[PDB]
């Protein structure tokens, strides 16, 4: 299940980021908002997923912005 949550969390991030740019805090809260029905994700987990997503290059950070991410296709 633990691994599974990561994937779902990731799916949530991509899904949310698709629907363009969001601040880190906002993104996290939404992930919780979406995931609430299934389970409450640990904050630490989310952050890890976000980075994974960036490596995957699903989403990127804004060049000059405090904690902001853009959805990059």
């Amino acid at each position: 299940v633990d691994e599974d949550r990561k994937m779902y969390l990731q799916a949530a991030i991509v899904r949310i980021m698709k629907a363009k740019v969001l601040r880190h805090n906002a993104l996290i809260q939404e992930v919780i908002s979406q995931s609430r029905a299934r389970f409450n994700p640990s904050i630490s987990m989310i952050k890890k997923c976000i980075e994974v997503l960036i490596d995957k290059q699903y989403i990127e950070r804004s060049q000059a912005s405090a904690d902001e991410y853009s959805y990059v296709a």
Binding site: A19, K20, L22, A26, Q29, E30, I32, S33, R36, N40
Partner: protein, 76 residues
């Protein structure tokens, strides 16, 4: 003061408040009564979304006042 708050079950709940209290606390009172995590809650006072770290006296909320609760809002 005791403020009334309209929930998403279609009812209205009165809760204990001090004007000096930060508004994020009211979210927790609403969790306690309605079982909705303060993480996902947004308080709207008369048309506008209430802040978090800002206090209730900053919004001039009185004991007759009424709050509306809605889930998170994002533009896109």
């Amino acid at each position: 003061m005791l403020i009334k708050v309209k929930t998403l079950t279609g009812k209205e709940i009165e809760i204990d408040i001090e004007p000096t209290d930060k508004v994020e606390r009211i979210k927790e009172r609403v969790e306690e009564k309605e079982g909705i995590p303060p993480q996902q809650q947004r308080l709207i006072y008369s048309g506008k979304q209430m802040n978090d770290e800002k206090t209730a006296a900053d919004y001039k909320i009185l004991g007759g006042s009424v709050l509306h609760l809605v889930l998170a809002l994002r533009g896109g």
